[PDB]
Amino acid sequence: TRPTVRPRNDVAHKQLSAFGEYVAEILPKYVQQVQVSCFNELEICIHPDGVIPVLTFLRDHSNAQFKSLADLTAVDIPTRQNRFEIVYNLLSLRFNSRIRVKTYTDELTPIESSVPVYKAANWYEREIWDMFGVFFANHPDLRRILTDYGFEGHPFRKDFPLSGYVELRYDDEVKRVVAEPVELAQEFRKFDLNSPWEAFPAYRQPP
Amino acid sequence: ASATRFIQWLRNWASGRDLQAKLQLRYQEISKRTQPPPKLPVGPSHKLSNNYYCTRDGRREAMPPSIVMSSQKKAVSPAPPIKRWELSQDEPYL
Amino acid sequence: GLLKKTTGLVGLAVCETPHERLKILYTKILDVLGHIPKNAAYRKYTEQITNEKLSMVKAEPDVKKLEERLQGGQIEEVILQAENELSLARKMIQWKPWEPLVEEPPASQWKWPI
Amino acid sequence: QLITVDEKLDITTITGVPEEHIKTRKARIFVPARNNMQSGVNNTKKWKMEFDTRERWENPLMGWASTADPLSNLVLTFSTKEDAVAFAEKNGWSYDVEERKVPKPKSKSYGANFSWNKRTRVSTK
Amino acid sequence: TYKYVNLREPSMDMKSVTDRAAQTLLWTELIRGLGMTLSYLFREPATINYPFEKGPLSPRFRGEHALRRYPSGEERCIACKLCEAVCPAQAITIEAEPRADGSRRTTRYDIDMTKCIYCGFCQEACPVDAIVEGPNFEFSTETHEELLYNKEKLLNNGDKWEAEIAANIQADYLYR
Amino acid sequence: GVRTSPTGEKVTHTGQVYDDGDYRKVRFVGRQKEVNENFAIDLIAEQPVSQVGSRVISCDGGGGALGHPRVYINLDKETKTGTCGYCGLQFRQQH
Amino acid sequence: TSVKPIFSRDMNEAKRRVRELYRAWYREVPNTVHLFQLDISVKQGRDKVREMFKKNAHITDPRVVDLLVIKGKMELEETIKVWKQRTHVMRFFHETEAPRPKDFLSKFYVGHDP
Amino acid sequence: SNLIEVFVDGQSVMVEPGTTVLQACEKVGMQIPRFCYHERLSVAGNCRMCLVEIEKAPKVVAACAMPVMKGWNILTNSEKTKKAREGVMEFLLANHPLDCPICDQGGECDLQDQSMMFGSDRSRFLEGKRAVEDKNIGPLVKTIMTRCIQCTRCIRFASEIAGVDDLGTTGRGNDMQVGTYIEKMFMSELSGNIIDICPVGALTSKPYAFTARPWETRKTESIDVMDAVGSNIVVSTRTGEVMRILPRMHEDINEEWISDKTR
Amino acid sequence: EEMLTNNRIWRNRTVDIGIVTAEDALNYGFSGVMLRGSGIQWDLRKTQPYDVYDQVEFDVPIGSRGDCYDRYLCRVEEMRQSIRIISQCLNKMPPGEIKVDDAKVSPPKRAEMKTSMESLIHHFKLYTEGYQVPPGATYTAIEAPKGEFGVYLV
Numbered sequence A: 001t002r003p004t005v006r007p008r009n010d011v012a013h014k015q016l017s018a019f020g021e022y023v024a025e026i027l028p029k030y031v032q033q034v035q036v037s038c039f040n041e042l043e044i045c046i047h048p049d050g051v052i053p054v055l056t057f058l059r060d061h062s063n064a065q066f067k068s069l070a071d072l073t074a075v076d077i078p079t080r081q082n083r084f085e086i087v088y089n090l091l092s093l094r095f096n097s098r099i100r101v102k103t104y105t106d107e108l109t110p111i112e113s114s115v116p117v118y119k120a121a122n123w124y125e126r127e128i129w130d131m132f133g134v135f136f137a138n139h140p141d142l143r144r145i146l147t148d149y150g151f152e153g154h155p156f157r158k159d160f161p162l163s164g165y166v167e168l169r170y171d172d173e174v175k176r177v178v179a180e181p182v183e184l185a186q187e188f189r190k191f192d193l194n195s196p197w198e199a200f201p202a203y204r205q206p207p
Numbered sequence B: 001a002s003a004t005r006f007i008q009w010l011r012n013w014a015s016g017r018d019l020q021a022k023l024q025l026r027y028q029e030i031s032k033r034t035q036p037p038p039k040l041p042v043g044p045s046h047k048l049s050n051n052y053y054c055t056r057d058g059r060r061e062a063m064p065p066s067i068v069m070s071s072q073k074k075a076v077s078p079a080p081p082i083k084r085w086e087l088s089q090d091e092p093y094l
Numbered sequence C: 001g002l003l004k005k006t007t008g009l010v011g012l013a014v015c016e017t018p019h020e021r022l023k024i025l026y027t028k029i030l031d032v033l034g035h036i037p038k039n040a041a042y043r044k045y046t047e048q049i050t051n052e053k054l055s056m057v058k059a060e061p062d063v064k065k066l067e068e069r070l071q072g073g074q075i076e077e078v079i080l081q082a083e084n085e086l087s088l089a090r091k092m093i094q095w096k097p098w099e100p101l102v103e104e105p106p107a108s109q110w111k112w113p114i
Numbered sequence D: 001q002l003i004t005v006d007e008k009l010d011i012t013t014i015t016g017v018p019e020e021h022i023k024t025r026k027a028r029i030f031v032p033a034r035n036n037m038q039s040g041v042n043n044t045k046k047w048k049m050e051f052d053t054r055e056r057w058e059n060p061l062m063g064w065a066s067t068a069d070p071l072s073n074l075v076l077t078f079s080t081k082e083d084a085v086a087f088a089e090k091n092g093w094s095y096d097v098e099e100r101k102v103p104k105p106k107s108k109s110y111g112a113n114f115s116w117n118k119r120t121r122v123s124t125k
Numbered sequence E: 001t002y003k004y005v006n007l008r009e010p011s012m013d014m015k016s017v018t019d020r021a022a023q024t025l026l027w028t029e030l031i032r033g034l035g036m037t038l039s040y041l042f043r044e045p046a047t048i049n050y051p052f053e054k055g056p057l058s059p060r061f062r063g064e065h066a067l068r069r070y071p072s073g074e075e076r077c078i079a080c081k082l083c084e085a086v087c088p089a090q091a092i093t094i095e096a097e098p099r100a101d102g103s104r105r106t107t108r109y110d111i112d113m114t115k116c117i118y119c120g121f122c123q124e125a126c127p128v129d130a131i132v133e134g135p136n137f138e139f140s141t142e143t144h145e146e147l148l149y150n151k152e153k154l155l156n157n158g159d160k161w162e163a164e165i166a167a168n169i170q171a172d173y174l175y176r
Numbered sequence F: 001g002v003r004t005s006p007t008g009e010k011v012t013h014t015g016q017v018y019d020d021g022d023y024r025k026v027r028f029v030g031r032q033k034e035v036n037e038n039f040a041i042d043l044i045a046e047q048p049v050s051q052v053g054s055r056v057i058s059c060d061g062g063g064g065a066l067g068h069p070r071v072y073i074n075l076d077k078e079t080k081t082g083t084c085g086y087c088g089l090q091f092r093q094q095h
Numbered sequence G: 001t002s003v004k005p006i007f008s009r010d011m012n013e014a015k016r017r018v019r020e021l022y023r024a025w026y027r028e029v030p031n032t033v034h035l036f037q038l039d040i041s042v043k044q045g046r047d048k049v050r051e052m053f054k055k056n057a058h059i060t061d062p063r064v065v066d067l068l069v070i071k072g073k074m075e076l077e078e079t080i081k082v083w084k085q086r087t088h089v090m091r092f093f094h095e096t097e098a099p100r101p102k103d104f105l106s107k108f109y110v111g112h113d114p
Numbered sequence H: 001s002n003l004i005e006v007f008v009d010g011q012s013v014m015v016e017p018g019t020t021v022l023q024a025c026e027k028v029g030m031q032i033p034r035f036c037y038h039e040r041l042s043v044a045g046n047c048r049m050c051l052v053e054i055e056k057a058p059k060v061v062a063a064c065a066m067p068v069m070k071g072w073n074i075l076t077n078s079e080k081t082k083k084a085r086e087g088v089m090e091f092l093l094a095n096h097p098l099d100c101p102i103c104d105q106g107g108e109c110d111l112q113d114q115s116m117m118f119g120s121d122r123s124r125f126l127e128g129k130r131a132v133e134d135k136n137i138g139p140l141v142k143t144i145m146t147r148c149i150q151c152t153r154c155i156r157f158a159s160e161i162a163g164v165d166d167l168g169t170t171g172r173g174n175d176m177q178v179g180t181y182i183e184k185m186f187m188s189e190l191s192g193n194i195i196d197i198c199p200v201g202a203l204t205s206k207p208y209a210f211t212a213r214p215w216e217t218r219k220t221e222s223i224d225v226m227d228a229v230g231s232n233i234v235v236s237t238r239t240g241e242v243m244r245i246l247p248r249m250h251e252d253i254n255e256e257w258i259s260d261k262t263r
Numbered sequence I: 001e002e003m004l005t006n007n008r009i010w011r012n013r014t015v016d017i018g019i020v021t022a023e024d025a026l027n028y029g030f031s032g033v034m035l036r037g038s039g040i041q042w043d044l045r046k047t048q049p050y051d052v053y054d055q056v057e058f059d060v061p062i063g064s065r066g067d068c069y070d071r072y073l074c075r076v077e078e079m080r081q082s083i084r085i086i087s088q089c090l091n092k093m094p095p096g097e098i099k100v101d102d103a104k105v106s107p108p109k110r111a112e113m114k115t116s117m118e119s120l121i122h123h124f125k126l127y128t129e130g131y132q133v134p135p136g137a138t139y140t141a142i143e144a145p146k147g148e149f150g151v152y153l154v
């Protein structure tokens, strides 16, 4: 119990590992990977076809009972051919436990909408469509939610520039707000911060 | 604090509380705005020996996730069922 | 025992006959589980936990002492969970998740850091 | 039920980028050179994609560096050269790829410093 | 542990039922609410007489920025650019070169006070206490341009406010 | 010290001054050019050199932890003074 | 090259959805001008709609066409329900952008942009 | 044919005879810390930052200088290894001056970075530090020799690469000093390179002095035109202005050096 | 509470207004008082506690009708419990340092930064490059005043 180091909890690590393979045994058709982090969080990585079967099972199964969708989001990794990682964070009140379910898609492949499983997923999928451009099939009402009306692009993609492409001002001649190509009085100053010395040997990739 | 006796009684009666004991305006009970200097303590790593950083390096103890299954007996739940909450004994019903 | 005036949860009505309702629901779940392949992990695990719950229902005629054994909250919460399990079992008949993995991911799909 | 689409991947019309910043840009795909001020090699592991530098000018009020190039700070990271090229192709950017530079393997020998008859004998330590 | 906020059955005896009828017909609980606002009418108000009286502040208050000097009059800032690096808003802009006596000193030090989030990171990062956030908060302007501070403005602020800044630093530096 | 250009505009301690013909000086018409008057290069020169009896002296700017990081200054060269790289104070080794 | 479709199995089905969208936009322009009190004519509005479809005429991937149609319907719904304001409808006409000549010499005189 | 099998943290690797422990670690993508070792200079083995444990060997070996032996298992991350690095870093920093805010190396300093990754996070040195007089070696390289860590890279480069036997060490012990002894200028056509190979801010570019910090520069990889060699260079710019020129490694052209006209 | 709790006008405006069932609240992703007003017994300070919430005693208020009035009573009672927690924090405040004694994460004290070489290096690097974090992803949540507040941090 060194004072500055976060203590381990092996009991939680063991319990989550056992449940991880329990889920893999029951849904082998869709489960591609199961892992538990060193701070005791369980992740199920699945084929995208399994979004509805897997999420239904975790919600309704008597030994799972993940009734609450805490969060639904996406991550963009341009180096992958399926660049978008879709992440579901679920909470089980009955068993006081959390689980993460992850799948993937590319710019042109639809993902089945999870609104039938969780009504909470409605706006989360609109946000993912808005910020990443991932289409969700059978969504009752898919449209932008955060961006401006008529906004072009998906800002949270890694290749969308920080300041975008257009900016707004009031123009007296046309007596309205107009959109024009972005110019910055002071360009954002890119910093190269990474140290050229490796920090964490435990995570070194093979050469 | 400068309210006359009659006014103190009037607002005490109207509110139904003894308001003079817990006034919402602050007077002389607050801390002085000048204070003596502090002398803060140091942490557990302030030692001259037996203190090698490698033995107290939380960041370097982090490990990649444990792969339970990859595509490269009794039923279980994620954890034991949550224990039912108890009613408060301080004040069970408001 | 004296009847519950409320379950405490908005919209969850008290059940007047919880033992009978639970026996019906678990029996239905076992029936539906019979059309799933015998070696499918879902059937084996759900049969095991369903039979445990059903055994506890038969062996305990008191609701409050039954709620303690079931460890699922109010008895009306256990009934709702039994109904949710039945609905899932019917769906898993049409999904057949016990079949082999439909497709492997690309090479570096789950590699982090990149 | 799946479908067959044999054409090349071209998402240039559903990314919302202005046409000027698709067809007039030049992406450079490279592995960053080691900073010669330091010996660490940890920043020469991954492939980078950057775009061609454009005009910066002085702001009249303050003298700050102004730009009209939305891509001036855009840098993407890729595991392999093939990943970077594939990303550039589908987004419609012309690109140059520079082959990775790996330090030559050297023959080091402390003993050579004290050679009997060779020029590698060092005059100081 | 938990408690119920609203789970109580009213008594159905004749006195209780008649107490509730009086409350309904004679508006007793509404009259009680009138008593509370009446008691406030006769309390001393909490208002202070700004600008003749001021709200209290502490030595840690983060206000207008200033560039400081050593007692000799030399500038403290040696153009390390730690403040510029840490600034969450990128509100700081710095240029530097050797001074005519070889000193390491800035030729530009701008803070865009309309970018700045007044977070105090710059004064935490400074190794020599050159850049600080002073105690002034009454510097609203009539134009946007007046809030783009260059080095001359920031040095004047330091010269203007140093007497208070030094006393504030004295009060709090043992907590840093 | 703060000089003035042949146009009358004051020259800052960084040597800045709009030249004769730079339109940008219109921003000062009806207003003023902010210029700090206490030039730190002149102020630090006013300080006297401190005579010390050791080859190496240390400086922290004064004020303890209110000064600058403590540095050590070598005073072996007699042709010049050691200067603090942080605060600019000067030191010399007596005989 | 076996990929999951969005809506259209092939370009023939996609071009049907494109024509349906074009009709919906074409009928809508008269209402948009009237409702938003725009100072342009229905002819200019429909010419602009035509110009927007034309820029994408070179696509051959049905999935890309489907996404363009999905966005087109989203854009149309924003307009019909007056979620857009007049400023949004008029952003298609870029009335405040000065001409940017597109010949080598003109660019050469103004700067370094190719 | 004559390759021998060695292990880096239990991972087998086949290496030519004469390969050092440091070079063996490179093959598995592990970079041993170093200060005195430069792969293009003669081996020195004096900083001791490369000390690494060999399994079953009671003594840590200098990885930069020690040839590998068949079957050796190099424990690049053992407590014995980590404690050796911490001890050496502590000695390196004992007399080093608190100059980071005023030192041009700040932000791209091997001493800073390796102290972060391999050293302790605090000091237990309660004495006064050494202070050294600076030495004028010309208009291109400024010397702040109190920052020198006596790695001798500059001496070896000047002798071996530049072919100038002007730099050396005088005195001995803690008072050992790198320099020219007499008043001399190191004005070789390759002199500026010693700025790059000096790991600390002891040797810095006079023209570049104080103008920028590493993290704020943009690196444009380009080519030199000051002659016909075509040396690969990095043009460092900031806010629309060229700040300095750095070499870019090209084994078949300029290796990792540039001429002083290029620089 | 004198102004509102028993006020018949206030009750008319809030009683039986905006009823959400416990089942709907869960499926819609509600949290905090939006769950507890409908009778769900859930509070992350009790069930998934953090920094020292397991060492303090307090009661979670629970509603019975899942309407605005019950959610208003829950928020009023949560203020009283906050005062109860604050009292225990005032009495049980321990001595010691206030940031982790590990200068590769938390900056050194200013006096150390100005005396010790290691401290100055670490101060310099923490305020420029910043500390590196080992690769990984976490979803962390707290019982924020408005409900479950979390971050998915990669």
Ligand SMILES: CCCCCCCCCCCCCCCCCC(=O)OC[C@H](COP(=O)(O)OCCN)OC(=O)CCCCCCCCCCCCCCCCC
Pocket (backbone or CB within 6 Å): E024, E025, E026, E027, E030, E031, I008
């Ligand atoms: C000899 C035999 C004699 C025979 C005759 C005997 C007659 C006397 C006995 C009969 C009862 C007398 C009192 C009747 C007064 C009127 C009562 C009334 O209407 O108020 C009840 C009303 C009910 O509303 P609620 O409480 O929400 O629930 C009702 C459920 N349907 O609730 C309300 O109206 C609430 C009103 C809300 C708005 C109030 C805002 C102002 C409150 C402060 C006013 C204070 C009174 C000031 C009067 C000043 C007059 C100058």
Ligand code: SF4
Pocket (backbone or CB within 6 Å): E083, E086, E087, E088, E089, E090, E091, E092, E111, E115, E116, E117, E118, E119, E120, E121, E122, E123, E133
């Ligand atoms: S207070 Fe914060 S935002 Fe403002 S200049 Fe300082 S670091 Fe930047």
Ligand code: SF4
Pocket (backbone or CB within 6 Å): E076, E077, E078, E079, E080, E081, E082, E083, E084, E094, E122, E125, E126, E127, E128, E129, E130, E131, H101
């Ligand atoms: S104000 Fe302080 S932190 Fe900023 S550049 Fe000057 S010395 Fe460095």
Ligand code: SF4
Pocket (backbone or CB within 6 Å): H096, H097, H098, H099, H100, H101, H103, H104, H105, H106, H107, H109, H110, H111, H112, H147, H199, H200, H201, H202, I121
């Ligand atoms: S050489 Fe490195 S550690 Fe030494 S003062 Fe300069 S930046 Fe700091």
Ligand code: SF4
Pocket (backbone or CB within 6 Å): H147, H148, H149, H150, H151, H152, H153, H154, H155, H178, H197, H198, H199, H200, H202, H203
């Ligand atoms: S001056 Fe630099 S390169 Fe030369 S010995 Fe000292 S630290 Fe090494």
Ligand code: FES
Pocket (backbone or CB within 6 Å): H033, H034, H035, H036, H037, H044, H045, H046, H047, H048, H049, H050, H051, H062, H063, H064, H065
């Ligand atoms: S790198 Fe081996 S001793 Fe210096």
Ligand SMILES: [K+]
Pocket (backbone or CB within 6 Å): H105, H194, H195, H196, H197, H198, H199, H200, H201, H202, H203, H204
């Ligand atoms: K150097």
Ligand SMILES: [Zn+2]
Pocket (backbone or CB within 6 Å): F059, F060, F061, F062, F068, F084, F085, F086, F087, F088, F089
């Ligand atoms: Zn000094």
